[PDB]
Amino acid sequence: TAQSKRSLWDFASPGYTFHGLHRAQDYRRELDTLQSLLTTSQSSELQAAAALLKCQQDDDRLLQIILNLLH
Amino acid sequence: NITLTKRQQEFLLLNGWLQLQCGHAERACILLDALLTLNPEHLAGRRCRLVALLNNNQGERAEKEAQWLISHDPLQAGNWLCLSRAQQLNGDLDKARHAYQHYLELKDHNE
C-alpha cells in the first residue's frame, strides 16, 4: 500500500535537519573531524564510513575546480 | 575506544537519512551502520536503517531490527508496521498480517 509506504517513510524520518547559525562551517568541520576520527578505528565498517566521507570531501574539491573553469 | 559527540551522531544520522532520500541506499547503510556500531541505542538511527534495509532488499535483517525496536517500545505502532513489511518481503505473509493488525491496534488513527 502506498499509504503504508508513506507511513514507513514518515517513521524513518528523524523529523529535523541540520540547524544552527553556521551550518555550512559546522558541516565541513564535523565531516573533517569525523573522517579522521573513524580512520583510527580497526572495524572495517567504521573504516568504510571514513573512506566514504574522505571520498566526497575530495570529490567535491575536484568539482569545485570544474565549476571555476566553467565560471 | 571511539565515542561520538551528539553533533557527530547527528551528522551520521542526517547524512544517512538524506542519502536515503537521494536513492543512495548503500551510502545510507554504511553511514547508519557506523553510527549504530558506536551508539547501538540511537533509536532514530535504528528506524532510518530499518527502512533502508527494506530498500536495499535485506528483509531478514530488517525483521531482526524490527524485533529489536519492538522489545524497546512494544507500544510504538511504527515498529509493528516495519515488522509487517519485512515479513511480507521475506514471504511470511500470514505473519505479516498479524504484525499489521498489531500496528492497527496501536496506531494513532488521527494522523
Author numbering:
A (entry chain B): 50 to 120
B (entry chain A): 2 to 112
What is the paper's account of this structure, in its own sentences?
Several gram-negative bacteria employ type III secretion systems (T3SS) to inject effector proteins into eukaryotic host cells directly from the bacterial cytoplasm. The export gate SctV (YscV in Yersinia) binds substrate:chaperone complexes such as YscX:YscY, which are essential for formation of a functional T3SS. Here, we present structures of the YscX:YscY complex alone and bound to nonameric YscV. YscX binds its chaperone YscY at two distinct sites, resembling the heterotrimeric complex of the T3SS needle subunit with its chaperone and co-chaperone.
